[PDB]
Amino acid sequence: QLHNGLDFSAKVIQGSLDSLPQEVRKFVEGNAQLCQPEYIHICDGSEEEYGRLLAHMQEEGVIRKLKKYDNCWLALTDPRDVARIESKTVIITQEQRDTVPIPKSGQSQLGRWMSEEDFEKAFNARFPGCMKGRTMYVIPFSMGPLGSPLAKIGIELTDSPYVVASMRIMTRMGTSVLEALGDGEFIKCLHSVGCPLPLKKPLVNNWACNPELTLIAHLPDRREIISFGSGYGGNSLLGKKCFALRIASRLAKEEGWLAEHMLILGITNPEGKKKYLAAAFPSACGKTNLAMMNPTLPGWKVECVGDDIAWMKFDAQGNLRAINPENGFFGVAPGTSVKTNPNAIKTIQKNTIFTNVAETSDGGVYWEGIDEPLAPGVTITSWKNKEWRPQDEEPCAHPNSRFCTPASQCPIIDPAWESPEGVPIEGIIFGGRRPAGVPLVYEALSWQHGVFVGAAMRSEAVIMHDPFAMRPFFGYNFGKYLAHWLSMAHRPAAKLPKIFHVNWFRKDKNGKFLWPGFGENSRVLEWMFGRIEGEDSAKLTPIGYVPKEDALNLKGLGDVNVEELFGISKEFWEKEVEEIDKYLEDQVNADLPYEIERELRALKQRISQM
Ligand SMILES: O=C([O-])C(=O)[O-]
Ligand SMILES: [Mn+2]
Ligand SMILES: [Mn+2]
Ligand code: NA
C-alpha cells in the first residue's frame, strides 16, 4: 500500500492475519475492505471464547440465560426475521437452465435463479460498509469429521455473535480447522445482518436484521455463499443449508457423490445385526423423531448418526458410505415431547441455545406440543416477550422456533457418528404427510422406480410436491439431479440401497390417524430390515411391494385397521399419476430423464390394469 487503507492487521482483536493461509487472508482482508468492520476476530473454537461471547450477548440483552438448565440460552428475534425466505433465496449461474429446469408454465417451484448481472447490482446495494462499527468474526469450520475424506471446509465471515455461537455447535470450528485446511480449497461464506452503525433503522428486540434487503445467494462456480439481512437459522448459519445442501449438491454432481436432505440412523435387531438407513422427509413429518426413535419392539436398538443432512459416496467396495456433515442438531422445537422424542428432550437439557420459544417463570423452556404440565403458579412468557396463557389465540412459541444442541449429547448418538470412512447405507426411505390413498409403507420395484418415487414425493403443508425433500435445496437443475441419481446404477460394484416410501399420517373417513406412530414405527423398520435381508415378506402391488398379510408385527397395538391402512384404490392412484405426470411435464420438461418418464408410463399402466 501507498497509504494505510488496505492492511487490516491493526484491527485484529484475536488471532493474526499473518497466521492465516494465503487465500484465507485474502478472503478476510478483501471483505474487511468492503464491509468496513471496526474489528476482526479470528475464532479459535475454545470454550473460553464461547462462554465470554455468550456472557457479552447476555449483558447486551441479545440473549437470556435459562436458569433452570446447565449452560442454556434463549434468543428472541425481531418477528420479521423468523425463518428461511425462499423467495429471497437464489442461485447464480451463467444460464438459468443450469440452476433450474425451464418450467412450461413460467414459474419454477424447483429453485430460484439470478443472473450474474442482477446479483452484482444487489451485492453493491448491500455490502459496502455494512459492518461499520461491528466486529467481523472469522469462523473456520469443517462440515463432517475433521479427518474425514468426505468432509469439506468453509470460512464464514459474520457480524453476528449469535451466528458464531450457533456455528460452534452446528459445525466443527476453530483453530484446528485452520491447521487442517492449510493451503487447500474452502467454501467462501459471507454473512451480514445488514445494520451498519450508527443504526439507520430501529433495533427491534435487540435483534439486528434488514428484512427489506434480505437475500441469500449461492455462487457455485465461485464456491461462494453470500447472505445479507437475516440473522436467522438457515439464512445465517451458512454451513447447514447453503453449504451442505445447495453448494454441496452441485459439488456432489461434479465429483460423483450425493448431498442429501436425509437423516442417518443405525438400527440393530434382536440378533445383533446392524444396518444403517437414510430417510428424506419434508420439514414437518417426523424426521428428528425417527432419527432418535425409542423403539417399542423388544430387542431392537436405534442409534442416531444425523437428523438432517447426509453426504454419501460409494467406496471402492461399492458400499454407499454416509457421513453427517453437521456437529449438532438445529431442530424445530414445537412438537418435541418425552412422548414424541424422549431422546431429544434428554439432549437439549444442557449447553443448548433456544430461539423463539416460551420461557417459564422458573427459567425453563416451553412450546406447543411439549405435553408437560406446569406446577400451579408457574407462568409463561411467550416468544414475543409477553405474558401468556394456554387458552390465548396465538402460540407461546413461534412455529419455526428452535433448539440448537451438540450432537455428542444425544443419549443414543451412534458410536460411528464421527467415523471418517462413514457408515454403510443399506436402505433409503422417502416419505410425507398424506391423509389419504398412500399406504403405511411400500418398497420400490427397482433403482429406477425408487428414483421415481423420490421424484414424485408430495406432502400436506394443501398437498404440495417436494421431490427427495429437496425442493427448497437443489443446488442445480432438478432434471440433472434425477439423471445423477440414475447414473449410480451404471457404475460397476455399486451396491444400490433398497428404496422405501412411508406414510405415518394416513387417516380414516372422519379424520382419525390409522397408525399410532412414534416408537411403533420400529415395526415398519423391522419389515424394511428383513426386506434388505432378502426375506419374502412382500406382496406385489401396482405401486410397489407392500408387507404380506401378517408380515408386519402388530402385537400390542390392538385392532389395527390393516385393510384401510394398506388399501390401494384405482380411483385415487389414477388421479395421483395424472397429477405427477402434469407436474413433471411442467416443472422438469426437457430435462426429465427418459428413465423417469418410463417409470411414470409404467405406473400409469399398472394402475390401468387393476
Ligand atoms: O431447518 C431445517 O432443517 C429445514 O428447514 O429443513
Ligand atoms: Mn432440514
Ligand atoms: Mn411419528
Ligand atoms: Na432478542
Swiss-Prot record:
**Where do the segments described as Omega-loop lie?**
454-475
Q: Which GO terms describe its molecular function?
A: carboxylic acid binding; GDP binding; GTP binding; magnesium ion binding; manganese ion binding; nucleoside diphosphate kinase activity; phosphoenolpyruvate carboxykinase (GTP) activity; phosphoenolpyruvate carboxykinase activity
Oligomer status and interactors: Monomer.
Q: How is the cofactor bound, in the record's words? A: Binds 1 Mn(2+) ion per subunit.
Pfam families cross-referenced by the UniProt entry? PEPCK_GTP, PEPCK_N
* Keywords for the protein's UniProt record, in alphabetical order: Acetylation, Cytoplasm, Decarboxylase, Endoplasmic reticulum, Gluconeogenesis, GTP-binding, Kinase, Lyase, Manganese, Metal-binding, Nucleotide-binding, Phosphoprotein, Transferase, Ubl conjugation
Name it: Phosphoenolpyruvate carboxykinase, cytosolic [GTP]
Where GTP is bound, by residue?
A284, C285, G286, K287, T288, N289, R402, R433, F518, G519, E520, N521
Describe regulators of its activity.
Phosphoenolpyruvate carboxykinase activity is regulated by acetylation and glucose levels. High glucose concentrations favor PCK1 anaplerotic activity by triggering acetylation on Lys-88 (K91ac). At low glucose levels, SIRT1-mediated deacetylation of Lys-88 promotes the cataplerotic conversion of oxaloacetate to phosphoenolpyruvate. Phosphoenolpyruvate carboxykinase activity is inhibited by 3-mercaptopicolinate.
What is the annotated localization of this protein?
Cytoplasm, Cytosol; Endoplasmic reticulum
The UniProt annotation places Mn(2+) binding at: K241, H261, D308
Q: Which residues carry this modification: Phosphothreonine?
A: T175
Which GO BP terms apply? cellular hyperosmotic response; cellular hyperosmotic salinity response; cellular hypotonic response; cellular hypotonic salinity response; cellular response to cAMP; cellular response to dexamethasone stimulus; cellular response to fructose stimulus; cellular response to glucagon stimulus
Reported effect of changing H465R? Destabilization of the closed state of the omega-loop, resulting in decreased capture rates for the weaker binding substrates associated with catalysis in the phosphoenolpyruvate to oxaloacetate direction
- Where N6-acetyllysine occurs, the residues are K67, K68, K88, K509, K512, K582
In short, the EC number is 4.1.1.32, 2.7.11.-
Q: List GO terms (cellular component aspect).
A: cytoplasm; cytosol; endoplasmic reticulum; mitochondrion
Q: Which HAMAP family match?
A: PEPCK_GTP
Species of origin: Rattus norvegicus
